[PDB]
Amino acid sequence: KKVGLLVMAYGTPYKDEDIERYYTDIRHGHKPSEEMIADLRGRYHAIGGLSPLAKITEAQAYGLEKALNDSQDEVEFKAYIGLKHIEPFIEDAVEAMHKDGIEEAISIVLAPHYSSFSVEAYNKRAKEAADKLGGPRINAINDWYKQPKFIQMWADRINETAKQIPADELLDTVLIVSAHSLPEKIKQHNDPYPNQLQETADFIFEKVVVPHYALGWQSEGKTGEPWLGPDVQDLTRELYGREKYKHFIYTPVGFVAEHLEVLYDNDYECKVVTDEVGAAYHRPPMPNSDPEFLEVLRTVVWEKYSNL
Numbered sequence: 001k002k003v004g005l006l007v008m009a010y011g012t013p014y015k016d017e018d019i020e021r022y023y024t025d026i027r028h029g030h031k032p033s034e035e036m037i038a039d040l041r042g043r044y045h046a047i048g049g050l051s052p053l054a055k056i057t058e059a060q061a062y063g064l065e066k067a068l069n070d071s072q073d074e075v076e077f078k079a080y081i082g083l084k085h086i087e088p089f090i091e092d093a094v095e096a097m098h099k100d101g102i103e104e105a106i107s108i109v110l111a112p113h114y115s116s117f118s119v120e121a122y123n124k125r126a127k128e129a130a131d132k133l134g135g136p137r138i139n140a141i142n143d144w145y146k147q148p149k150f151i152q153m154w155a156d157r158i159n160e161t162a163k164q165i166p167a168d169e170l171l172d173t174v175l176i177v178s179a180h181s182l183p184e185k186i187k188q189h190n191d192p193y194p195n196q197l198q199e200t201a202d203f204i205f206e207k208v209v210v211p212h213y214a215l216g217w218q219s220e221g222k223t224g225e226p227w228l229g230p231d232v233q234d235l236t237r238e239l240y241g242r243e244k245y246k247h248f249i250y251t252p253v254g255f256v257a258e259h260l261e262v263l264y265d266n267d268y269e270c271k272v273v274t275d276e277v278g279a280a281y282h283r284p285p286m287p288n289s290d291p292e293f294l295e296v297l298r299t300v301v302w303e304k305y306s307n308l
């Protein structure tokens with residue numbers, strides 16, 4: 001009959017007036033100072049005012065629902081959006097599923113890699129919300145970066161960009177694969193997050209014509225602990241100082257859409273570094289709601305339903 005499709009994501013402020021409560025929710029309820037609020041507000045204004053993450057997340061979630069429902073007639077999928085730090089929250093989506101009579105759901109996070117700080121928090125809040133309500137039964141997908149269509153989608157985007165680079169400069173081209181940084185302490189407990197991203201970079205590298213690649217991290221938080229390094233800005237400086245690369249291709253494969261952590265942390269902060277060393281900047285289009293990416297998620301979700 002009907003199976004809920006719990007599509008979860010970070011969330012973004014819909015209006016400029018939402019930035020305060022959005023930052024507060026991110027900061028575990030501790031309201032940030034005006035200085036922190038002003039810096040975040042400035043980054044949003046620097047990328048044009050607000051992030052298109054809310055509209056892209058909707059197009060991905062409902063594009064996945066249409067992609068699943070048009071490819072088979074074994075089960076009807078119904079997509080429910082559950083955001084981490086703004087409404088509709090994860091708990092609102094599970095409430096809507098239980099109210100709608102959904103008895104079985106499949107959950108997926110719009111981030112291909114698993115971590116205790118990211119996907120585990122998504123699944124924990126979703127499973128506990130359904131437990132307090134009595135339903136639905138949530139079957140969680142933890143990661144899906146190993147999907148071949150996902151690896152091939154990124155390789156195609158990189159190869160499409162590399163072919164605009166002159167041949168005599170391709171040897172001086174490097175591919176920077178990155179994702180959102182996390183506190184370094186997760187490596188002390190063998191969290192799969194750093195190893196999963198190294199695997200993703202390894203898989204993509206063996207399918208692109210770019211001869212050089214390096215793994216980095218970005219968007220590290222405002223804390224007092226060490227975070228996963230090297231930062232993509234610092235890595236860009238070190239790689240130019242050692243190899244004098246002429247082209248830097250940034251693929252933050254940990255993200256699936258053009259949001260603040262791409263439009264600012266890459267398209268501004270990384271471009272400042274390449275401008276400084278005199279190298280060219282390249283950032284292939286994010287997956288967004290491209291049909292190829294909807295086919296990636298369609299294959300992932302259908303593979304999960306078949307296995308249960």
Ligand SMILES: CC1=C(CCC(=O)O)c2cc3nc(cc4[nH]c(cc5[nH]c(cc1n2)c(C)c5CCC(=O)O)c(CCC(=O)O)c4C)C(CCC(=O)O)=C3C
Nearest residue numbers: 010011012026027051053111118180220221222259260261
């Ligand atoms: C693992 C991870 C993902 C990927 C997986 C997933 O997608 O879930 C992700 C995505 C995103 N993170 C986002 C935004 C922000 N994240 C922040 C802060 C933080 N993120 C963290 C982690 C992650 N974040 C952590 C551990 C903190 C520090 C918290 C603290 O120290 O208490 C902050 C505060 C300022 C700062 O970054 O310092 C902002 C504004 C947006 C939306 C951008 C937009 O609005 O377009 C997106 C897609």
Ligand SMILES: [Cl-]
Nearest residue numbers: 026084085117
């Ligand atoms: Cl968070």
Ligand SMILES: [Fe+3]
Nearest residue numbers: 010026180219
């Ligand atoms: Fe974040």
Ligand SMILES: [Fe+3]
Nearest residue numbers: 218219220265
């Ligand atoms: Fe930053």
